[PDB]
Ligand binder design. Structure first.
Ligand code: J6W
Ligand code: J6W
Ligand code: J6W
Ligand code: J6W
Lengths: 193, 193
């Protein structure tokens, strides 16, 4: 039932480790899922909708993990609080690099992919800004830039910088250094005068 | 002579304000330059090579402006020194938003476009890192992250953040606020403990 659907998704995510979506045919997905090409189309209109579903699950997995942190504060310093939260994105997207890479490509051609990404970035920026505001209200952070503008740039930094590490781009921060790098830039810019 | 070449480039940059490169034909470029389609191909192998030339000139215009700042230090504080340098990218790419937007798209499909971008980002990161190192040697900046890793993330922040402002993306920092936003994040992360 929904098992044939998982088979298509797992075949898609596995095939994206090797080649781009343009190099993957519907026949490839059906064969890997052990169904016919017409049977495929009963679960998905296109290979793009398969990628969209994959990307939706990764993004919602990150968002839910961040949701879980928010409701359970980790008893630790402010630097570590920020570290733990940025780590959700490092670990979640870093555990799904093929989908992250293919989703980024799809933003140029899929309105749904762009709108999905944009919606969750908006959500994460707003929550970053609220935490910054809370820190300012309690006197732990100085009132420097507008909180939402600062939060926007930091979250766009993470998007671009994590993606480059995962993709092995030149230039990029080494994957084993990128978390420490982003944390330093967040904490100095949030708490620095 | 080279005048027919400028006509093609100026037609291309003007046409990219209205539609993407895929929506622009070689006939459109020839007509706008007042030459035939075969005459076009004597100056350029393809419409992609036209975009590549446009992007090369914008990037080299930024790099040369940054070169000029480096050789003439502006008598001013450290915050302003960084402001003046980030402003070169704000003003140069912001004066060529159609080409900047089309060049970014081309990175996904043109090896030359990606290699051109990557080469100059490497160059600008290395120079950022040298200035950070110089500041540390003179005791003005603390020895926190590796200078080259810090410089990488800040320069990737600017790339992603300026592009989003220019493109009117959601989310983005307003174009009239993005320079102040980036400067704050650079100065706090370079000089902050
Ligand atoms: C990347 C990212 C986005 C939002 C938040 S909120 C927070 C403190 O709980 C850390 C964090 C990190
Ligand atoms: C804070 C933050 C927000 C969005 C994104 S997207 C990504 C990899 O695509 C890492 C990341 C980090
Ligand atoms: C964006 C960018 C890149 C390199 C440099 S160097 C400098 C100080 O002269 C400011 C600056 C800004
Ligand atoms: C510091 C720096 C380096 C590269 C780039 S690219 C860009 C718009 O595409 C702005 C920018 C800024």
């Amino acid at each position: 039932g929904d098992d044939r659907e998982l088979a298509i998704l797992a075949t898609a995510e596995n095939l994206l480790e090797d080649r781009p979506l343009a190099d993957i045919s519907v026949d490839d997905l059906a064969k890997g899922a052990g169904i016919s090409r017409p049977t495929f189309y009963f679960y998905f209109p296109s290979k793009e909708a398969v990628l969209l579903t994959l990307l939706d699950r990764v993004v919602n997995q990150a968002d839910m993990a961040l949701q879980t942190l928010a409701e359970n504060p980790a008893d630790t310093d402010r630097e570590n609080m920020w570290r733990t939260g940025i780590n959700v994105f490092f670990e979640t997207f870093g555990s799904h690099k093929a989908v992250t890479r293919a989703g980024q490509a799809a933003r140029a051609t899929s309105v749904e992919v762009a709108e999905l990404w944009s919606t969750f970035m908006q959500k994460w920026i707003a929550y970053t800004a609220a935490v910054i505001d809370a820190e300012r209200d309690r006197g732990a952070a100085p009132r420097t830039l507008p909180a939402h503008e600062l939060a926007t740039a930091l979250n766009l930094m993470n998007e671009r910088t994590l993606f480059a590490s995962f993709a092995g781009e030149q230039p990029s921060v080494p994957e084993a250094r990128v978390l420490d790098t982003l944390v330093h830039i967040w904490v100095t810019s949030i708490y620095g005068e």
